[PDB]
Amino acid sequence: EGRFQLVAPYEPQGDQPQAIAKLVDGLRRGVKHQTLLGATGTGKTFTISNVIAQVNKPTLVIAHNKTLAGQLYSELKEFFPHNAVEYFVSYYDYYQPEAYVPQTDTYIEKDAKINDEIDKLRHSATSALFERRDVIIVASVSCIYGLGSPEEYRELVVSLRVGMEIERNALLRRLVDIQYDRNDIFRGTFRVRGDVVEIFPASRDEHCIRVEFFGDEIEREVDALTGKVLGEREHVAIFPASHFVTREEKMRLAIQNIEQELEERLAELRAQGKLLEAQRLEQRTRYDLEMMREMGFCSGIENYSRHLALRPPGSTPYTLLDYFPDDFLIIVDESHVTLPQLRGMYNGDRARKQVLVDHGFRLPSALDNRPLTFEEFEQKINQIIYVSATPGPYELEHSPGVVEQIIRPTGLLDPTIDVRPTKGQIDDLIGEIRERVERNERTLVTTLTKKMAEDLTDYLKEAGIKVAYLHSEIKTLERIEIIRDLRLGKYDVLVGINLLREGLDIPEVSLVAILDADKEGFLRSERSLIQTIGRAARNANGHVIMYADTITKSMEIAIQETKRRRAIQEEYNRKHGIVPRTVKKEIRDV
Ligand SMILES: Nc1ncnc2c1ncn2[C@@H]1O[C@H](COP(=O)(O)OP(=O)(O)OP(=O)(O)O)[C@@H](O)[C@H]1O
Ligand SMILES: [Mg+2]
Ligand SMILES: [Zn+2]
Numbered sequence: 001e002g003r004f005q006l007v008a009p010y011e012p013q014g015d016q017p018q019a020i021a022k023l024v025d026g027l028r029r030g031v032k033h034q035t036l037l038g039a040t041g042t043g044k045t046f047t048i049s050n051v052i053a054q055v056n057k058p059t060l061v062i063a064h065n066k067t068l069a070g071q072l073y074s075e076l077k078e079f080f081p082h083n084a085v086e087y088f089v090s091y092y093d094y095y096q097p098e099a100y101v102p103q104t105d106t107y108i109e110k111d112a113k114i115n116d117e118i119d120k121l122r123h124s125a126t127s128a129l130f131e132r133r134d135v136i137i138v139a140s141v142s143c144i145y146g147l148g149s150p151e152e153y154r155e156l157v158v159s160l161r162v163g164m165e166i167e168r169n170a171l172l173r174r175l176v177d178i179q180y181d182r183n184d185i186f187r188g189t190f191r192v193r194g195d196v197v198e199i200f201p202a203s204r205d206e207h208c209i210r211v212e213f214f215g216d217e218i219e220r221e222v223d224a225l226t227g228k229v230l231g232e233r234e235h236v237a238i239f240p241a242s243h244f245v246t247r248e249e250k251m252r253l254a255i256q257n258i259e260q261e262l263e264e265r266l267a268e269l270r271a272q273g274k275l276l277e278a279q280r281l282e283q284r285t286r287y288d289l290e291m292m293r294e295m296g297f298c299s300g301i302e303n304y305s306r307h308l309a310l311r312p313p314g315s316t317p318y319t320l321l322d323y324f325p326d327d328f329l330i331i332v333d334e335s336h337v338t339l340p341q342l343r344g345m346y347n348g349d350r351a352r353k354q355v356l357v358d359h360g361f362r363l364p365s366a367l368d369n370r371p372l373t374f375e376e377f378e379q380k381i382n383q384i385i386y387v388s389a390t391p392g393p394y395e396l397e398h399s400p401g402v403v404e405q406i407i408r409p410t411g412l413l414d415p416t417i418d419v420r421p422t423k424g425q426i427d428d429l430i431g432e433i434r435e436r437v438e439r440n441e442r443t444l445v446t447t448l449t450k451k452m453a454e455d456l457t458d459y460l461k462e463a464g465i466k467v468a469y470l471h472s473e474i475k476t477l478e479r480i481e482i483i484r485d486l487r488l489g490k491y492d493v494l495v496g497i498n499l500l501r502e503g504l505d506i507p508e509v510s511l512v513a514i515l516d517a518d519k520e521g522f523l524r525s526e527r528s529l530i531q532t533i534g535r536a537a538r539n540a541n542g543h544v545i546m547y548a549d550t551i552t553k554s555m556e557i558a559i560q561e562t563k564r565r566r567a568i569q570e571e572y573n574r575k576h577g578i579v580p581r582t583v584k585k586e587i588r589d590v
């Protein structure tokens with residue numbers, strides 16, 4: 001196939017169209033980097049899907065954390081339910097990276113249970129890229145992680161057609177030769193019928209363990225289930241059950257190589273050191289090899305990825321970006337945060353693994369199993385598009401100007417900003433607060449020190465006001481619980497240090513306080529401030545008060561931009577006759 005079908009209730013509102021089409025044209029004109037500058041709540045996720053469909057290409061949308069990768073998922077689902085949309089994540093978004101604390105001389109094993117759901121979609125994701133051209137995969141920074149080679153996937157593939165002759169025990173083998181999927185057992189798996197005309201209940205294949213069970217009697221091919229039959233076929237494809245699978249003849253040789261190293265490493269470790277003389281690792285190396293020649297896989301296999309692949313030391317790893325057709329597209333959400341973090345992933349891995357090698361719990365060759373370097377990520381790009389309200393210096397210095405999109409569909413507008421002295425700052429912020437309770441409106445405050453927030457909360461309650469918390473990480477459960485508590489009348493105010501903590505996109509909030517605007521901090525930067533400001537644009541009377549003594553260069557930039565931004569949204573509601581009205585949202589249950 002290969003046709004994108006973009007469903008949707010609305011239509012391009014704001015200045016979406018200018019945006020969309022500008023990007024599009026720019027792909028086509030063959031440009032590498034483009035940056036989308038979209039304000040908060042102006043609808044980026046949607047604008048994006050439009051461009052996607054105009055270029056009919058397959059893409060990976062990299063988000064910077066589990067949750068986000070999630071929202072983007074479902075969202076993009078409602079947009080295209082007739083196309084391929086997968087969710088590539090990993091156990092980096094949870095467990096412990098088998099490390100070692102030397103001082104406390106305390107070891108920590110790779111304790112990570114296989115959470116099947118994950119694996120399920122990891123496999124559907126890979127597969128999809130060799131069948132259709134209409135695929136979409138949302139993923140974490142984790143996509144730049146080492147993975148089995150792709151070619152050795154489009155090779156160990158079981159192409160099933162009609163008219164060809166294969167034993168009833170011949171395919172049963174290429175089948176176990178790929179770490180069998182579900183051809184064993186709560187039964188006999190896929191054993192029945194027999195002869196030249198067999199049965200074979202090829203089930204649990206992860207690439208579609210959503211109960212599909214493919215049956216092929218003397219190819220045959222007819223999608224089934226745990227109940228009854230459905231949907232007809234004449235050509236199927238079965239995929240490996242591991243991303244790190246290898247061919248026997250190759251494994252045989254890898255093993256010898258592993259060995260030459262473990263040997264010749266103890267000789268160099270013998271001479272220089274005496275860290276348990278050198279050895280101690282022999283316990284698991286050898287224990288690992290024995291479990292290897294006996295069975296294709298083993299314990300921490302992944303560690304021997306470079307060796308198994310049969311590629312020279314230092315080699316750059318294989319990644320999900322290598323499974324995408326030669327001309328694909330990558331969307332990077334919240335790019336000013338993602339990018340930087342995905343940058344120092346190699347450094348932190350290398351750091352925590354070199355330790356295990358000095359202490360000797362894995363060998364040099366284990367270093368070769370790592371994430372990409374930022375340059376290795378670069379050399380792999382075909383064409384990208386960065387999305388963010390606060391684009392970083394990288395995107396701007398590589399991109400040819402930006403592509404502005406700053407008009408919300410409701411026609412709401414970035415607040416107005418005030419800046420007042422630190423003297424008498426509290427009795428002032430109380431007065432400007434009482435007045436919001438009298439108009440049924442909520443507030444949000446921010447400090448720098450957890451002892452300044454604390455110093456306030458009480459001061460506030462002692463003023464006769466329903467007030468919020470003072471503790472940063474108050475779980476996530478009770479956390480979502482008190483957000484709900486606010487947009488309801490429970491409280492009128494709310495103090496926090498970090499307000500950029502998602503969930504805080506509330507409409508009943510009309511005023512936002514920034515108590516140490518001119519101080520030093522990450523939470524007081526050109527980018528970070530603008531972002532805190534947008535928390536006051538979910539309303540028709542959004543205002544921001546900045547309490548300070550001086551006007552930092554950061555403060556300046558923010559204010560300057562918000563201004564300009566607001567002007568243009570206003571001259572626009574003019575030409576069109578729109579009166580800004582506050583968004584409404586329902587108030588569910590936790
Ligand atoms: N053209 C449109 N017509 C109607 N609704 C739209 C349109 N475009 C976008 N929306 C809406 O805008 C909302 C938020 O858009 P989007 O997800 O991009 O917010 P955002 O840009 O991510 O905000 P933030 O930067 O704060 O995260 C959604 O509720 C979405 O339905
Ligand atoms: Mg977003
Ligand atoms: Zn460069």
Ligand SMILES: [Zn+2]
Pocket residue numbers: 576
């Ligand atoms: Zn218009």
